[PDB]
Symmetry: D2
Amino acid sequence: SGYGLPISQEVAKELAENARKIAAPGKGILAADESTGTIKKRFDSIGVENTEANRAFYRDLLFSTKGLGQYISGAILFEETLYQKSPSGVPMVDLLKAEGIIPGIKVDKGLETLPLTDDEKATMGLDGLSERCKKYYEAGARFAKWRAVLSIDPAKGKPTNLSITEVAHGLARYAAICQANRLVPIVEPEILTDGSHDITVCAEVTERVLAAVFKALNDHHVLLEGALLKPNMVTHGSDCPKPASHEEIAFYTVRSLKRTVPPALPGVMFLSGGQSEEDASLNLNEMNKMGPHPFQLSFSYGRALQASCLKAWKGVPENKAKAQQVLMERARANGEAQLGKYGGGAYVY
Amino acid sequence: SGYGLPISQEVAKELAENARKIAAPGKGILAADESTGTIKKRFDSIGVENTEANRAFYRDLLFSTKGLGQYISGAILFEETLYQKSPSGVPMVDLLKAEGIIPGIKVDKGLETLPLTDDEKATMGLDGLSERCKKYYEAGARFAKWRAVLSIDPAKGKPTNLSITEVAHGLARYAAICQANRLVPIVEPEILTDGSHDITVCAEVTERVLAAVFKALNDHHVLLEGALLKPNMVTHGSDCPKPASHEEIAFYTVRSLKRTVPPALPGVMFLSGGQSEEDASLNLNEMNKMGPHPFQLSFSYGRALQASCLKAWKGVPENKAKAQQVLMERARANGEAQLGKYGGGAYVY
Amino acid sequence: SGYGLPISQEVAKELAENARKIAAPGKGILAADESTGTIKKRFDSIGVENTEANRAFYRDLLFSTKGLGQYISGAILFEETLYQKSPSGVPMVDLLKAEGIIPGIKVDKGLETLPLTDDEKATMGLDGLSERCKKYYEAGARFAKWRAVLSIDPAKGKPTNLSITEVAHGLARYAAICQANRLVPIVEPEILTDGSHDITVCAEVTERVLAAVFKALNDHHVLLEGALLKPNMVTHGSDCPKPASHEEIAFYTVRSLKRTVPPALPGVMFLSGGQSEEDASLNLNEMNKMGPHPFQLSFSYGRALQASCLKAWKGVPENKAKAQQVLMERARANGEAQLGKYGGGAYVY
Amino acid sequence: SGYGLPISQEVAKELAENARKIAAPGKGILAADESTGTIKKRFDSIGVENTEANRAFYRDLLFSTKGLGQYISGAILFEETLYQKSPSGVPMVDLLKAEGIIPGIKVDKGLETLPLTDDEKATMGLDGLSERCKKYYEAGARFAKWRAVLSIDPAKGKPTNLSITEVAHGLARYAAICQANRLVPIVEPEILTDGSHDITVCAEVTERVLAAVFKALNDHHVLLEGALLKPNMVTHGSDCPKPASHEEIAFYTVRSLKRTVPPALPGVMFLSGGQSEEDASLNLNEMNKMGPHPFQLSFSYGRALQASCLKAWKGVPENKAKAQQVLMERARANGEAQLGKYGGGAYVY
């Protein structure tokens, strides 16, 4: 024998049905799972102290936005927020439920340097993960997220084989543990934009990484029908003076995905990765002008959904409505982009 | 650096364009590449001596069939036939060209037992392969074929890891060598039907094998846009009293493919693998009732296109027309099956 | 570039020097790192309640044995014991230090089923491991232990590839994290004796497992000069009526080790794995009659050093001296076995 | 099941016994297997036309040297020479037999560029290899040789993963095929000296390569007891102005071997790889001052045994005796080096 045991057909159905709900046409994911230190930076950029009350106010501001569920299929939460009430006393998950937004939970415990690498990172969090998933499920979460990070540095041979091997192994273990506890896993192997590398370099690295990842998912008996991928778009490096055209970014991103991702996977929800809000929309829109695709190409945006929102709010409570208006504008833009119908706002082998 | 060098864009285009021509809608591949010993068996079943003249007569009978190119995009040849003339003196490739059928060439040198395995097989042929490809290209071939074989035997742990590793490695080396010489490679990892295993067993093994294969193709820098897959359908074992329903076979075959095959690959051309001519048609037709698919699902049939043809001919020259009529009937059936429009003739996770 | 960064030469020296001290001629390891639930079983077999005071009494009984350091180079502790005082108020580590015994610490967090395997186990504990190692170092530990488990079951294809891959990956990550914090890692891939398999089966599986392990240690930049291996001996399965001869067990164990273990590794310290105290001694002694070996072959025994000791004590405080006498007898026997000079007590390719 | 079938104990014994005979103390291998084009270069450097008669004369000159068998355990032959007679009519193998020198045969078919690599090389020759081995055995050969080549180029990421994977896979297939036909395989993964890299770079690459190789040998069921390794010494790159000290070269070479090579392997017979005759002797001698080692460290020298010999001969028949005298001087030097008793002639983690 020696093969994977049969998955529960009941569990499998739930995962697959929720995965397709998350990857719904014209919709995508709001990534609001900033940890305490990551949100601190976000708040720093608008001069807001990182208190629990400010975070509760901001998350409530996001999830209590009227009609958000029209463009947002799911919202990724940090554990704090999952068990949190709005300043008015309403549980955050109840806000999501009211809009029909599926709650999701970030489950990794962050990054740690792989010994004897040049600051290359392993993602931690497998310990107790299965037990956390059960609790999170009971709390209302139906999908999870785990962020792995890789860097490009040709001079230093980054990403190294150890980097790729570790990322792949961790993602697969996490994915399988999640599905065992009825959570759709979002597989996020983010290749950072750091550097002055070309888009064609990014494409090569993305292909290698995704190939290793999906081989590992297979080896660990991960149900692709009940999972989602959250990859970087394929772009120039962030130190490049010329940002690639939306056409280029679209071409190479789709190419990289079609070269490595089996089509049983229901959806690819891109991270925005430092891109401006408008690039993130226009780049996604361009990809979906190239449709129909074997899987849904959509978004799982944090910064590219919140940047203007945060700056409209400024920590000022009265600016809540305005901020919410801004969020809707960007949710609509990316929903429309998902369908390749975004108007814009203010073959190479 | 350390990544694959850029492929020639000119070569890449040719491979991709010819691959899509081979995987043309409503069309498929005639596998007439029986080696001297394999054709001997075919002829044995109708009582025909395996002389060069009988083989020349039979191949001419196949390729000189009027209107064959309507349903047959390409024909796989054995080396003999590639450099052969019909009994009337016409080169075999000229017959193919007249129907617009692309010539293809079997390039493997057959099977050899992996030491210290239970009769598990490596495919030989890499030595001189590159040089053979050039000659074959000049002779008019535009695609190639390489058959690897795996067996299922739960009691003996077949296919073993060594088996899968060898198959994958050989296919990838071959594929890359072919593309370097402007030949579209057909990747054929055939999982034999031998045994009394269930269809779900076949599905598991097929997934494992294809996952390993496509990881290897990636590692060897194989252009999927310019390649084709020739896999077994997913079926019960040949010693099973109950042949699975066409619905089942269709479901599990597509599932297995969508779980492992990146969609940049233009086409999957199934081997018939012992199936009756009618099952081979009906099974393919059923898959294409489930369309649209991320890649073309079609055929690369030897026995399932020739069985009745051979028996109509019987070695009798006067039965040539009748035999050709039979071939057309089956080519039409499978072409129609490719489009899911075959009428018939005489979710589980 | 892309290779591992240079290890600290200062750290490397410490690891290597302590590893060789642990693998000292005529000496071995006392494994007293039974977790709370594992020690409970031990105490259950002699009718002793598992209170903190009984555990403190028993561990003090072990480590306060006069002259123990003559045969025991190191003692593996459970975290509790590392920060524990004897009933007389003496820190456990101070007892070890007085005999010149190096303290070691079990650092894994136990076992968890790999999803969709037949109860095959991953070892958990990487999360926070690096931080724990620092504390443990400060507490006086100079080596660590991490137990992985594999099972043989030919019918079920155990150990599966996922099992081996997980075990290897976890051991390597742990090893590298330990060395980064100046702890010699003991690599323990235990193949359980469960089953009625032959010794030749055990040998094959042991080889496969160790080959995968040491490839992984290499991939993760683990310094073999500063590590130790704690493997099963190669034996018949525990359900076999005939326990193999000491000669056989010796032959196949050494063979398996020499076929897979690079000789830069200073020592192999065997787990006793259910063997009687006398078999564990006689089997080790037989191996060292076959010397000189490329590495030290010695012991890291829990049950095979404590079985009689526990039964002499019976929870009765007055039996302390007698119990300590028994421990010395077995420590002497195994030390003498290490040198192939044990008298006994009460080529196949 | 799924593991390798049991090897023939009779075959295994022969391989192991002949391997130990080849790796005999105070002895090593004369590599005289220069192909037609490689010998041409050798002859070019002394102004000799590459006729069959000159080659027959030179090989006879080598193998007819009186007392050669005192220092030479085996001689590697090119196929031509294996079936060749000396100018006096004596079969070359009969010359070897008279000195008790074991005949060995080069069985690879040379190198071919891996597609889409920067001129990285696969070794060809598996096709028909098994059949060739049988003939060669009958002709008197009892061991074989297969040369794989890797290059170091940090800027280009050489050796790439594809390079290492291909080398390892080819060596393992070859090794297993050889043992199946009763030939001891010499595993030669030569890392070329090309470049200005440091010795520590060479050491890292050598370790990675050997780790991959020996994992592959294990996966293919290669009997290490009946095989030999022919690796590069660990040195600075050939474009380095400072040739490393003999002490350094000795340290890092042994270190690299002990870190990767299981001790069941009977012998490591170094290639000379461009080193002067005297360096090749002094470097080997230095390693064996560091003994005793887990395996025999010896030589399999071509250029470092023949350089002066060729220049003494100059194509002049009368210089035969002188040339033979020179060969003995160098055979004695390297034999003495094998034992660490060469007088000379005219821990870092």
